[PDB]
Every structure is written in C-alpha cells, then in structure tokens.
Design a protein around this ligand. Structure first.
Ligand SMILES: O=c1c2c3nc(n2Cc2ccc(Cl)cc2)Oc2ccc(F)c(c2)OCCCCCCn3c(=O)n1CCCO
Ligand SMILES: O=c1c2c3nc(n2Cc2ccc(Cl)cc2)Oc2ccc(F)c(c2)OCCCCCCn3c(=O)n1CCCO
Ligand SMILES: [Ca+2]
Lengths: 325, 162
C-alpha cells in the first residue's frame, strides 16, 4: 500500500513531456496509444500543474536580478517562459465552451474562479507595456507618485497568486480519507449567512451615533506627532471622525487590537466622554457574549444530521469526476 | 525525561479510563492540521511578494534591533522565514497593528496590505476553531461506552510483564 504503488506513480510523472511529444509525432505507434488511458491522462494533467506552481516561487524571491530604480525594465528570463501556460489556459477555457451548452457551462461554481484569474493575469501585460513605452530614465524610488503604473502593476500580480494557489482543494474528492471531509465542510457555509445578515444590521446601526457625536473635534496631520493621522500609527488618534474610519474601527476591535484611550477628547469636556465610553461598551456585550455563543450551538446541531449518508454523496461526486476522461 | 510519568496512570481506577478517552481526541486534529497548513502556505506568499522592496538594515534602526521580539516591532514581512513566524504568533494576539505601515508615503499599497492581513483572520479564528469544537463534541459521545473493556486489557498486559 505504501511503497510500490507510491513509487510507480512518481515514476510515470516525470515522463509526461516525452509522452506528449510522442503522441504528437505519431499517434498510431506502440509508444503512442499509451496515453489514451483514463489514469495516465489524470497523472499527466496533475503533474503539469505543480511545475507551474513551482516556477512562481522563483519570481517571488529573486534568485538573481538587477537593482530597482528604472521606471520600466525589460522582462527577465523567468517571465519569458510563463506566457505559454497562460495562453494555453485561455485557449482551453475558450474551447471547452464550444462543445458544450452555454447554460451548461455557467452552472459550475469553479468557472467563477477561472474568469477572475484570467482577467487579473491579462491586465498586467498592458499595464506593463504602457509604462515601458511611455516612461524612460531612472530616478530614486522615494519620489514616485501614488498612482504610478509600475506600482499598480504589482498589486494585481501579488493578489493573483493567492487565487491561483487555493485551487488544490478540488482534488480531495479522489481520496477516501479527505473525501467525506469536503462534503461536511460544504454544509457549514450555509449557516453563517443569516448571522451575517443580523450582524450587518447591528453594525450599521451603531456606526452612526458615534460618528455623529465626535465629528466636532477633527484635527489635522501637521499638528500631530510624526505627521501620522488615523489608526495604524504608533499612537492611535482620530478614530471616530468620518464614516469610513468608524467602520474599520469597529471591525478591528473584535479581535482586540484597539486601545481604550481613543475615547478621550481634548477641550476638557467631561460629560461627552462618559456617553462615548458607554456607547462603546454596550456594543461589546451584544457582539462577543450573545452572538458567538449561538453560532457554536447551531453548528453543533447542524453537524449531527449530515454525518449520516456521507458516503452516498461522495461516490456520486467522484463518479461524476471519472466520467470526464 | 519528566513527561514519562503518564504511563503509570493505567494502574489506577480513577485516572485509568481518562487516558483511553484522551487517546481518541488526537485522531481528530490531523485533518484540520492538513487544511490549516495549506491555508497558511497559500497566504505566506503574497505578503512576502508585496513588501520585499522596503527592507532596511539594523544600524539605521533604534537600539540596533531588527525584526519582531524587539520593543518596537519592525521588518515583519521582509523574508519568507519571518513571514511564517509572524502569522503564527498573531493567532494568540501578540502582534500589533502598526507593522503594516510602510515608509515613503505610498498610500495605495498599505490598504491592500491591511486587507490581506484582515481577510486571513476571519478564515482562521471564526470558521475553523468553531468546527474542532463541534466535531470533538461528537467524537467523545461514542467512546464513552466500552471504556472499561479497553482499560482492563491494558492493565492486564501490564501485569503480565513482571
Ligand atoms: O462599566 C459599564 C457597565 C455596564 N454594565 C455594568 N457595568 C459595570 C458597572 C456596574 C455598576 C456601576 Cl454603578 C457602574 C458600572 O454592570 C452591569 C450590571 C447589571 C447588569 F444587568 C448588566 C451589567 O448587564 C446589563 C447589560 C449590559 C450593558 C453594559 C453597560 N455597561 C457599561 O456600558 N459600562 C461602561 C461604563 C463606562 O464607564
Ligand atoms: O475592515 C475590513 C472589513 C472586511 N469586511 C468588513 N469589514 C469592515 C468594513 C465594512 C464596511 C466598509 Cl465600507 C469597510 C470595512 O465588513 C464585512 C461586511 C460584510 C460581510 F459580508 C463581511 C464583512 O464578511 C465577508 C467576509 C469577511 C472578509 C473581511 C474583509 N474585510 C477587511 O479585510 N477589512 C479590513 C480593511 C482594512 O482597512
Ligand atoms: Ca473550467
């Protein structure tokens, strides 16, 4: 169970390029016709993906590169060899839509994660060539603008890797131990919706009074130490001034990362600070003691009804998988 | 050498059936450990790829201290070895919030950094720890029965060695 059948599969994995080119040159030989088997196709398709996912860790941490002061540099050798993968993925996505129903295509929920990836990969080429053609020269990095093309053309490339690495969860249905765990996790995500609705109402209700009470004492940045304004500084300040900051403030205090001296106002007024502190203290009891003690009690009940018939719904899925090769 | 006094609990009637019930709980953390490991190496990459342009040195910092564990934390998302220790310690609450603020005045990067840091907490502290409880609760109520047939077997196997 653990040695020979574990080694044969690793052995076949390495042979995928030569098998591909052999099928390409002659499809009726004895080396050809050996890839038209439902298991070998699976192994080859699975092995052709870890190579792509491993040629991306080299671009994250530079193995060898040049200094970073030019506006638009030419692409390096690692980036020259990634285009074929993207082009092949787009061509395959377009081809799958042809010999299949359009309504039949849109009924799968994974296609919704293969559209966003493709869009975020397609924007970067244009955003990079624009800066390669327009700009020229070199200047230090501490004087660039906030909306420079070279700065916007890296955030999308950083975001895309996360959505491209979380797709190894659709392979758990081919195993007997990790199989029935995805089916039990699929049910838990139908319990957070209603509590999310109630929490959203309870949060926009409170996000209004606190903003209405504190919008008289808004200072500026130059009059503050170290020219820092808002939370995320070393000394937090101006936390209930606008409506966009009052919504980020209330979110971060669920985990415990908000201090208590942010309710103290200048100008000596004492009657306002007490009402502010009471409004801040009433919001914690409703959210941390009454609501999180109900998710547990409901998810406990929901789990004990899906434990049964958990093998009739995994075999259906893995049968639907096999029938595609 | 001091944690080996737990193999003597099988010779007593009160502490005996407790080790047998603890032995079953350790077969539930494995799969959640697998899923958590995948969810953590997925996120440990983007944050490292976004912040590796602003790595300073030690001599230009106060008191010649670089990294977390100083009095004023700094350089938390520079390399891949620090990004993996940073994400671990934040589960308990020992990481501050001013570590996502970069120099050089750029404002559009800090927002994306803060959003990436904030999305990782909801998936780990609200959706996963609320499932270990609900599954360990079910696993315990099936081993409570026949808990005296498996303790006497063990203590019989003990006696037969002397
Ligand atoms: O300190 C409190 C507080 C409190 N409810 C309390 N306490 C403690 C307390 C007790 C007595 C006194 Cl003479 C002063 C403070 O205690 C109780 C006492 C009886 C209760 F039944 C109860 C809470 O729960 C009711 C719902 C919780 C509302 C929190 C408001 N609430 C509150 O917003 N603050 C913040 C005020 C900022 O200064
Ligand atoms: O502050 C948040 C935040 C948030 N989801 C939120 N909020 C609070 C919020 C509400 C409204 C506005 Cl206009 C701005 C912030 O609230 C919601 C609102 C509806 C939801 F359905 C929900 C969360 O849960 C979705 C999954 C959680 C993703 C966290 C992202 N997420 C997040 O990464 N940050 C960090 C940003 C750093 O500045
Ligand atoms: Ca697809």
């Amino acid at each position: 169970h653990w040695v020979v059948k574990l080694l044969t599969c690793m052995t076949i994995g390495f042979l995928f390029p030569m098998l591909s080119i052999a099928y390409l040159i002659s499809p009726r030989s004895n080396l050809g016709l050996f890839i038209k088997k439902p298991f070998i196709k699976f192994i080859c398709h699975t092995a052709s993906y870890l190579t792509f996912l491993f040629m991306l860790l080299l671009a994250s941490q530079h193995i060898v590169r040049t200094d970073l002061h030019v506006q638009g540099p030419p692409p390096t050798v690692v980036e020259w060899m990634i285009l074929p993968w993207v082009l092949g993925f787009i061509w395959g996505e377009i081809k799958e839509m042809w010999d299949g129903g359009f309504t039949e295509y849109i009924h799968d929920w994974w296609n919704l994660m293969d559209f966003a990836m493709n869009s975020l990969y397609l924007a970067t080429i244009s955003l990079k060539i624009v800066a390669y053609v327009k700009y020229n020269g070199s200047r230090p990095r501490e004087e660039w603008e906030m909306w420079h093309p070279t700065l916007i053309a890296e955030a999308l490339f950083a975001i895309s890797n996360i959505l491209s690495s979380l797709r190894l969860i659709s392979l758990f249905t081919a195993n007997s131990h990790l199989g029935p765990l995805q089916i039990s996790l699929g049910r838990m995500l139908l319990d957070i919706l209603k509590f999310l609705f109630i929490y959203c109402l309870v949060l926009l209700a409170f996000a209004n009074g606190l903003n209405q009470l504190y919008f008289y004492y808004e200072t500026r940045a130059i009059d503050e130490p170290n020219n820092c304004k808002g939370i995320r500084c070393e000394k937090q300040n101006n936390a209930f001034s606008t409506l966009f900051e009052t919504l980020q403030s209330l979110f971060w205090s669920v985990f415990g990362l908000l201090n208590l001296y942010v309710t103290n106002v200048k100008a000596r007024h004492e009657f306002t600070e007490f009402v502010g502190a009471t409004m801040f203290g009433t919001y914690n009891v409703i959210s941390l003691v009454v609501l999180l003690n109900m998710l547990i009690a409901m998810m406990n009940n929901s789990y004990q009804l899906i434990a049964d018939h958990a093998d009739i719904e995994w075999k259906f899925a893995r049968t639907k998988l096999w029938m595609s090769y």
